[PDB]
Design an enzyme around this catalytic site. Structure first.
Site, PDB file in Angstrom:
ATOM      1  N   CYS A  56       0.676  -6.901  -3.259  1.00  0.00           N
ATOM      2  CA  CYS A  56       1.754  -7.116  -3.506  1.00  0.00           C
ATOM      3  C   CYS A  56       2.849  -8.013  -2.098  1.00  0.00           C
ATOM      4  O   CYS A  56       2.507  -7.680  -1.039  1.00  0.00           O
ATOM      5  CB  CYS A  56       2.829  -5.675  -3.412  1.00  0.00           C
ATOM      6  SG  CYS A  56       4.441  -5.853  -3.879  1.00  0.00           S
ATOM      7  N   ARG A  78       6.235  -6.182  -0.122  1.00  0.00           N
ATOM      8  CA  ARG A  78       6.351  -4.891   0.536  1.00  0.00           C
ATOM      9  C   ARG A  78       7.410  -4.661   1.676  1.00  0.00           C
ATOM     10  O   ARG A  78       7.371  -3.595   2.250  1.00  0.00           O
ATOM     11  CB  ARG A  78       4.811  -4.920   1.259  1.00  0.00           C
ATOM     12  CG  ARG A  78       3.861  -4.558   0.138  1.00  0.00           C
ATOM     13  CD  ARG A  78       2.619  -4.237   0.564  1.00  0.00           C
ATOM     14  NE  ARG A  78       1.891  -5.403   0.861  1.00  0.00           N
ATOM     15  CZ  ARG A  78       0.921  -5.677   1.379  1.00  0.00           C
ATOM     16  NH1 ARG A  78       0.288  -4.457   1.960  1.00  0.00           N
ATOM     17  NH2 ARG A  78       0.235  -6.605   1.636  1.00  0.00           N
ATOM     18  N   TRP A 115      11.475  -6.792  -8.657  1.00  0.00           N
ATOM     19  CA  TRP A 115      11.993  -7.880  -9.413  1.00  0.00           C
ATOM     20  C   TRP A 115      11.128  -8.706  -9.429  1.00  0.00           C
ATOM     21  O   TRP A 115       9.998  -8.764  -8.750  1.00  0.00           O
ATOM     22  CB  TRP A 115      13.225  -8.313  -8.741  1.00  0.00           C
ATOM     23  CG  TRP A 115      13.204  -8.554  -7.508  1.00  0.00           C
ATOM     24  CD1 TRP A 115      12.495  -9.565  -6.720  1.00  0.00           C
ATOM     25  CD2 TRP A 115      13.641  -7.568  -6.311  1.00  0.00           C
ATOM     26  NE1 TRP A 115      12.602  -9.406  -5.575  1.00  0.00           N
ATOM     27  CE2 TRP A 115      13.317  -8.360  -5.064  1.00  0.00           C
ATOM     28  CE3 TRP A 115      14.265  -6.651  -6.505  1.00  0.00           C
ATOM     29  CZ2 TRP A 115      13.512  -7.705  -3.827  1.00  0.00           C
ATOM     30  CZ3 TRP A 115      14.457  -5.849  -5.251  1.00  0.00           C
ATOM     31  CH2 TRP A 115      14.205  -6.358  -3.884  1.00  0.00           C
ATOM     32  N   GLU A 163       5.524 -15.856 -11.293  1.00  0.00           N
ATOM     33  CA  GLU A 163       4.886 -15.056 -12.100  1.00  0.00           C
ATOM     34  C   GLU A 163       5.041 -15.487 -13.589  1.00  0.00           C
ATOM     35  O   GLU A 163       4.269 -15.297 -14.450  1.00  0.00           O
ATOM     36  CB  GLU A 163       5.099 -13.617 -11.941  1.00  0.00           C
ATOM     37  CG  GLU A 163       4.791 -13.042 -10.816  1.00  0.00           C
ATOM     38  CD  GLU A 163       5.391 -11.649 -10.363  1.00  0.00           C
ATOM     39  OE1 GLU A 163       4.771 -10.663 -10.777  1.00  0.00           O
ATOM     40  OE2 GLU A 163       6.677 -11.587  -9.818  1.00  0.00           O
TER      41      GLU A 163
HETATM   42  C1  HEM Z   1      10.743  -5.419  -4.828  1.00  0.00           C
HETATM   43  C2  HEM Z   1      10.301  -6.640  -5.439  1.00  0.00           C
HETATM   44  C3  HEM Z   1       8.570  -6.888  -5.581  1.00  0.00           C
HETATM   45  C4  HEM Z   1       8.141  -7.871  -5.549  1.00  0.00           C
HETATM   46  C5  HEM Z   1       8.856  -9.299  -5.261  1.00  0.00           C
HETATM   47  C6  HEM Z   1       6.894  -7.860  -5.913  1.00  0.00           C
HETATM   48  C7  HEM Z   1       5.918  -8.810  -6.200  1.00  0.00           C
HETATM   49  C8  HEM Z   1       4.554  -8.732  -6.436  1.00  0.00           C
HETATM   50  C9  HEM Z   1       3.781  -9.787  -6.809  1.00  0.00           C
HETATM   51  C10 HEM Z   1       4.148 -11.357  -7.011  1.00  0.00           C
HETATM   52  C11 HEM Z   1       2.905  -9.245  -7.287  1.00  0.00           C
HETATM   53  C12 HEM Z   1       1.633 -10.101  -7.957  1.00  0.00           C
HETATM   54  C13 HEM Z   1       1.575  -9.638  -9.294  1.00  0.00           C
HETATM   55  C14 HEM Z   1       0.644 -10.380 -10.316  1.00  0.00           C
HETATM   56  O1  HEM Z   1       0.154 -11.435  -9.665  1.00  0.00           O
HETATM   57  O2  HEM Z   1       0.553  -9.987 -11.479  1.00  0.00           O
HETATM   58  C15 HEM Z   1       2.813  -7.824  -7.119  1.00  0.00           C
HETATM   59  C16 HEM Z   1       1.882  -6.994  -7.118  1.00  0.00           C
HETATM   60  C17 HEM Z   1       2.000  -5.681  -6.926  1.00  0.00           C
HETATM   61  N1  HEM Z   1       3.201  -4.954  -6.662  1.00  0.00           N
HETATM   62 FE1  HEM Z   1       4.734  -5.633  -6.103  1.00  0.00          FE
HETATM   63  N2  HEM Z   1       6.612  -6.502  -5.864  1.00  0.00           N
HETATM   64  C18 HEM Z   1       7.740  -5.906  -5.931  1.00  0.00           C
HETATM   65  C19 HEM Z   1       8.006  -4.379  -5.859  1.00  0.00           C
HETATM   66  C20 HEM Z   1       6.900  -3.471  -6.089  1.00  0.00           C
HETATM   67  C21 HEM Z   1       6.902  -2.172  -6.063  1.00  0.00           C
HETATM   68  C22 HEM Z   1       8.382  -1.520  -6.291  1.00  0.00           C
HETATM   69  C23 HEM Z   1       5.679  -1.606  -6.039  1.00  0.00           C
HETATM   70  C24 HEM Z   1       5.360  -0.343  -5.910  1.00  0.00           C
HETATM   71  C25 HEM Z   1       6.102   0.910  -5.619  1.00  0.00           C
HETATM   72  C26 HEM Z   1       4.873  -2.950  -5.878  1.00  0.00           C
HETATM   73  C27 HEM Z   1       3.403  -2.630  -6.128  1.00  0.00           C
HETATM   74  C28 HEM Z   1       2.502  -3.775  -6.441  1.00  0.00           C
HETATM   75  C29 HEM Z   1       1.043  -3.594  -6.603  1.00  0.00           C
HETATM   76  C30 HEM Z   1       0.298  -2.178  -6.619  1.00  0.00           C
HETATM   77  C31 HEM Z   1       0.770  -4.803  -7.057  1.00  0.00           C
HETATM   78  C32 HEM Z   1      -0.748  -4.767  -7.470  1.00  0.00           C
HETATM   79  C33 HEM Z   1      -0.213  -4.985  -9.188  1.00  0.00           C
HETATM   80  C34 HEM Z   1      -1.496  -5.599 -10.066  1.00  0.00           C
HETATM   81  O3  HEM Z   1      -2.798  -5.561  -9.294  1.00  0.00           O
HETATM   82  O4  HEM Z   1      -1.453  -5.845 -11.122  1.00  0.00           O
HETATM   83  N3  HEM Z   1       5.373  -3.851  -5.920  1.00  0.00           N
HETATM   84  N4  HEM Z   1       3.948  -7.453  -6.432  1.00  0.00           N
HETATM   85  N1  LIG Z   2       7.141  -8.884  -9.271  1.00  0.00           N
HETATM   86  C1  LIG Z   2       6.722  -7.903  -9.695  1.00  0.00           C
HETATM   87  N2  LIG Z   2       7.133  -6.723  -9.416  1.00  0.00           N
HETATM   88  N3  LIG Z   2       5.683  -8.194 -10.232  1.00  0.00           N
HETATM   89  C2  LIG Z   2       4.912  -7.056 -10.958  1.00  0.00           C
HETATM   90  C3  LIG Z   2       3.736  -7.888 -11.866  1.00  0.00           C
HETATM   91  C4  LIG Z   2       4.376  -8.530 -13.067  1.00  0.00           C
HETATM   92  C5  LIG Z   2       3.392  -9.489 -13.751  1.00  0.00           C
HETATM   93  N4  LIG Z   2       2.623 -10.471 -13.096  1.00  0.00           N
HETATM   94  C6  LIG Z   2       4.196 -10.532 -14.918  1.00  0.00           C
HETATM   95  O1  LIG Z   2       4.479 -11.623 -14.555  1.00  0.00           O
HETATM   96  O2  LIG Z   2       4.675  -9.733 -15.968  1.00  0.00           O
END
Ligand code: HEM
Ligand SMILES: NC(=[NH2+])NCCC[C@H](N)C(=O)O
Ligand code: HEM
Ligand SMILES: C[C@H](O)[C@H](O)C1=Nc2c(nc(N)[nH]c2=O)NC1
Ligand SMILES: C[C@H](O)[C@H](O)C1=Nc2c(nc(N)[nH]c2=O)NC1
Ligand SMILES: NC(=[NH2+])NCCC[C@H](N)C(=O)O
Lengths: 361, 361
Positions: free
Chosen positions: B66, B69, B236, B241
């Site tokens: 993520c 973070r 969000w 993505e």
């Molecule tokens: C607040 C805005 C947030 C943004 C901009 C963000 C953005 C991202 C992005 C760009 C990825 C890569 C997704 C992909 O390539 O499929 C990701 C993965 C992830 N995010 Fe976030 N995230 C956010 C919030 C969160 C929240 C609220 C949580 C958890 C409480 C979180 C947990 C994770 C985890 C576990 C991954 C790995 C998901 C996977 O392996 O498919 N993120 N995040």
């Molecule tokens: N910014 C995020 N919270 N991304 C969570 C995973 C979203 C996913 N990669 C999609 O395009 O549907």
């Protein structure tokens, strides 16, 4: 004691593998006996033209970070293990540049110099790449990555004109000397390409240009236990290396903001993705320029495409494919190529090319 | 026997670390005694609202993949460990969507459902993301990534209209049932954004659109040995993505060639870098669209920038930073962000979010 052991082991492994690919499997036995006695008599062994010629190709094949490995068996190997003087080295380096450039139609080559004997180098090349721009400071002038070496060269009597594109001279050291010698590169030997855009005339106001042939000269070629610390090699450029890195990185030439200016877009908001648009136009400019001057270059899509074909051949040949995902993916549009969508085993297999500590710094 | 041991160990580690960050270091002793007896009496323990609320934040903080973070301590934790019926789950999921969307101003949230007891799940969510498009075949229709699940849903009586943007229904299974139940999502609850371009009118001819809030619903939240297999969370979107992946990958919507058409460029030569230009315009379209409809979204430069700030805070807090380079770098212009220029320790630290085997397929 332990050095004579490692050497023998690496030799057995390489000859077998080499002669197996060469169809000379029967000659392995007799060839290893000669090597065993050679190591005892002297403390090392001398490769045959065929051995290092193919070992240099195999090493290229095992270069996890190289995307252009599809062309591994076409490497033009130049044997210069007969060099004794600084003039011999200088002429060999001049020759490498001339023959590799080949009036634009770049020929992937490598010049083999004498390898290390008792761990000591015979020829020590200081240059990262044979052709490379200098870097200075007060405010950034030139290529920042060339700073430590530019300072070293200047500590030897060389002086750069302080433009952004000063050609560093050839700097190397012969066994027995305390300090390296240097030689200014003959401009007639160096191809440079001014950067222009096919649709945007104002692009030439940036006055960007780059050299045609990248010749990594500071890597070690390890073949059957033999350390060729000096073996300059070259391929042609993938446009991204110049446009998305050399001229884009904040730590390098940092030209994105200036590119945005000449193409007519604002640099106010990230949401307009001006850096991305800037990179695309800068990169298109690079490809169009090299092609226009008749200098070989490859776009990242063609390269990935050629690399996919490479992976298939390795599967067809029965060989395990190794690679570094983080270096195989191009800095621009990586998800648009197949490399992004798969994983690679980043294991080190010999023969290969390795990093070695820089004499300066 | 061995399960009751692992549980206790993970609990001791988590409470200490948790209460240390919470400033309740003295309460650790008394809290662990209660847990020890609880594990013996029943075979597990029940977290306090404060514990899982902060454990869910810590887990986000340890999510190597993520990029967002920096906003870990602002996570809106919704405790729904009191759900017993399929109506309770359905309403909780409807609630999550409503409250997270927040009329566009997306609120990073997570709904905690009952965790596994003796290894068995109480609530099993089948959906990858609460809001997601279906996928079909004869020729590609919809989102290919949704195929296996779309087939499963259809094996339960659900039928999609077969457009490229069919909303999959909520599908989950309660403990004690053999097959999952499903519920069509109320459209009034779902925000979708038609994709348009700020400077190119013809872009709307592509008739592209996407949903506003990505809510990963199939990951396991592990906190102090407790496995919350069902804990849908959301942040969000980062424009990339949708534009550089969901609508770009050949295996997904594969729209690049079509984008090239509407923006007026040819798809004949890679040297023109049409895919790259296509990606930039598609991505600009995405950012401009979400913003225009009042839906939160972030461009990759702002996100990396926010993530740099995150790294600094972790250094300032005394915590070790962990991350997956291959996922932190955006699919478009990775070398333009700091993430590309550094390395990350990809070690797994708990609490965290994990993948779990899909019930279907
Ligand atoms: C607040 C805005 C947030 C943004 C901009 C963000 C953005 C991202 C992005 C760009 C990825 C890569 C997704 C992909 O390539 O499929 C990701 C993965 C992830 N995010 Fe976030 N995230 C956010 C919030 C969160 C929240 C609220 C949580 C958890 C409480 C979180 C947990 C994770 C985890 C576990 C991954 C790995 C998901 C996977 O392996 O498919 N993120 N995040
Ligand atoms: N910014 C995020 N919270 N991304 C969570 C995973 C979203 C996913 N990669 C999609 O395009 O549907
Ligand atoms: C023929 C065209 C060639 C192409 C398109 C090509 C392309 C590439 C590219 C793009 C890289 C990454 C460079 C960087 O990011 O700095 C690379 C690295 C490398 N290539 Fe090539 N290459 C070619 C020829 C060769 C040859 C002739 C050899 C060796 C015999 C070779 C050996 C390597 C090695 C060892 C690396 C890693 C260099 C490093 O770590 O700095 N390549 N190549
Ligand atoms: C080590 C360096 O800072 C960075 O992590 C990497 N550099 C490079 C890279 N990719 C290429 N091709 N070349 C690089 O120099 N990706 C990763
Ligand atoms: C595993 C997958 O095929 C691929 O190696 C990776 N996927 C992703 C990636 N990066 C992100 N952010 N998301 C991905 O899905 N880089 C690497
Ligand atoms: N395509 C190649 N042979 N590249 C070798 C390294 C070139 C180096 N990245 C540069 O831009 O100068």
């Amino acid at each position: 004691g332990s050095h004579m052991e490692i050497l023998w082991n690496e030799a057995k492994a390489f000859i077998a593998e080499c002669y197996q690919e060469l169809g000379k499997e029967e000659e392995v036995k007799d060839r290893l006996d000669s090597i065993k006695s050679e190591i005892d008599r002297t403390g090392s062994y001398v490769h045959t033209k065929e051995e290092l010629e193919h070992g240099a190709k195999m090493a290229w094949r095992n270069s996890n970070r190289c995307i252009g490995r599809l062309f591994w068996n076409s490497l033009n190997v130049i044997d210069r293990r007969d060099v004794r003087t600084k003039e011999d080295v200088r002429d060999a380096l001049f020759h490498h540049i001339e023959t590799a450039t080949n009036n634009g139609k770049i020929r992937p080559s490598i010049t083999i110099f004498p390898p290390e004997e008792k761990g000591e180098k015979q020829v020590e090349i200081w240059n990262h790449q044979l052709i490379r721009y200098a870097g200075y400071e007060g405010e950034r002038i030139g290529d920042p990555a060339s700073r430590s070496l530019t300072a070293a060269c200047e500590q030897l009597g060389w002086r750069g004109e302080r433009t952004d594109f000063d050609l560093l001279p050839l700097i190397f050291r012969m066994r027995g000397d305390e300090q390296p010698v240097w030689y200014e590169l003959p401009r007639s030997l160096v191809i440079e390409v001014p950067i222009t855009h096919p649709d945007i005339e104002a692009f030439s106001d940036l006055e960007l240009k780059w050299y045609g042939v990248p010749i990594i000269s500071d890597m070690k070629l390890e073949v059957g236990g033999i350390h060729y610390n000096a073996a300059p090699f070259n391929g042609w450029y993938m446009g991204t290396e110049i446009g998305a890195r050399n001229l884009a990185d904040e730590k390098r030439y940092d030209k994105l903001k200036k590119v945005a200016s000449v193409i007519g877009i604002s640099t106010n908001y990230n949401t307009d993705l001006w850096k991305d648009q800037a990179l695309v136009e800068l990169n298109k400019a690079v490809l169009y320029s090299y092609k226009k001057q008749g200098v070989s270059i490859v776009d990242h899509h063609t390269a990935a495409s050629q690399f996919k074909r490479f992976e298939e051949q390795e599967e067809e040949a029965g060989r395990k494919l190794t690679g570094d995902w983080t270096w195989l993916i191009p800095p621009i549009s990586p998800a648009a190529t197949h490399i992004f969508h798969r994983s690679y085993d980043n294991s080190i297999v010999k023969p290969n090319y390795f990093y070695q500590d820089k004499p300066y710094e």
